[PDB]
Design a protein around this ligand. Structure first.
Ligand SMILES: CC(C)(COP(=O)(O)OP(=O)(O)OC[C@H]1O[C@@H](n2cnc3c(N)ncnc32)[C@H](O)[C@@H]1OP(=O)(O)O)[C@H](O)C(=O)NCCC(=O)NCCS
Length: 281
């Protein structure tokens, strides 16, 4: 004997837990992998939030100090979400994403019995190899025009009330309040109608949007648009959500297929109009 390596061998690469010192690299991987033409700071702030939500959730793949690939797992009580998968285009299609995902699953299986995600066209085939099954599509729409229609009765609140925690638990099927909180530390606005619905507005995005009726969801969405919301990701199985957004003359941006490994989570998707993020569920 001679050389002593205390990790599995995988193509001469190093895969390890990310820390906040790795934010710039994560951002670079993401912008490469997703061909993101937007401003950098946008991604940096999003990833700072992700590491607050799950400090030990991010795996990074390195080929000799060059950052090549990443992915994340976010834990709730009954399920975890895998999101933010990305391998730099020069390094794609040689098994790196598959390996990062394997490792994430390994971590997830010890803690929870259901793992879910929102799959793009490139990812879909990877996740299917691990026996992920289709749930329903989650469709990203851009809201183009302001409806000529006033609303009254929607307020922004600085602390999450218990009734919001309860209606979100019902919509999502789990506890993700720490995610809402992390976004609100960065300026995200919590809009509430009556005690029957809420929406979270962060940058140009509303998510989640949860409402006991289409009329309450509409009130929130109109006020969100006024506060700069231009995008919403709708679960395609909420029949009222697609009809709701039509008054904004929406433009479809992209869709994913939500997928699951393990047992179905009881969720109330009829009240669930806008998912939080493809990364988080
Ligand atoms: C999904 C992604 C992370 C895959 O990473 P990767 O290192 O290239 O994937 P792997 O080499 O391990 O390939 C695993 C499987 O992914 C799927 N895949 C990867 N790239 C693909 C693409 N270009 N088109 C269709 N399927 C693709 C295939 O099923 C592949 O298996 P195969 O080679 O036997 O057919 C992806 O290429 C990426 O970083 N893009 C980012 C944005 C995106 O569209 N996907 C992430 C969100 S779900």
């Amino acid at each position: 004997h001679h050389h002593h390596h205390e990790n599995l061998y995988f193509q001469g690469m190093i895969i390890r837990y990310a820390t906040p010192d790795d934010i710039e690299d994560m951002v670079s991987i993401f912008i490469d992998a997703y061909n993101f033409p937007g401003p950098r700071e946008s991604v940096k702030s999003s990833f700072e939030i992700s590491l607050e939500v799950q400090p030990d959730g991010c795996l990074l793949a390195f080929l000799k100090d060059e950052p090549v690939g990443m992915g994340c797992i976010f834990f709730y009580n009954k399920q975890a979400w895998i999101g933010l998968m990305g391998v730099k285009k020069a390094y794609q299609r040689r098994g790196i994403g598959t390996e990062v995902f394997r490792r994430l699953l390994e971590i997830g299986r010890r803690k929870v019995d259901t793992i879910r995600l929102d799959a793009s066209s490139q990812g879909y085939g990877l996740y299917k190899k691990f026996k992920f099954v289709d749930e329903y599509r989650t469709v990203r729409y851009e809201l183009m025009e302001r409806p000529i229609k006033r609303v009254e009765g929607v307020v922004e609140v600085n602390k999450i009330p218990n009734w919001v925690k309860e209606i979100d638990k019902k919509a999502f099927g789990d506890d993700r309040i720490r995610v809402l909180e992390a976004y609100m530390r960065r300026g995200a606005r919590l809009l509430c109608a009556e005690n029957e619905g809420f929406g979270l507005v962060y940058r140009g995005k509303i998510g989640p949007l949860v409402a006991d009726s289409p009329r309450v969801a509409e009130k929130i969405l109109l006020k969100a648009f006024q506060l700069g919301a231009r995008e919403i990701i709708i679960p395609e199985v909420n029949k009222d959500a697609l009809e709701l957004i039509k008054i904004f003359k929406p433009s479809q941006v992209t869709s994913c297929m939500r997928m699951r490994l393990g047992s179905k989570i009881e969720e109330k998707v009829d009240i669930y109009y806008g998912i939080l993020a493809y990364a988080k569920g």
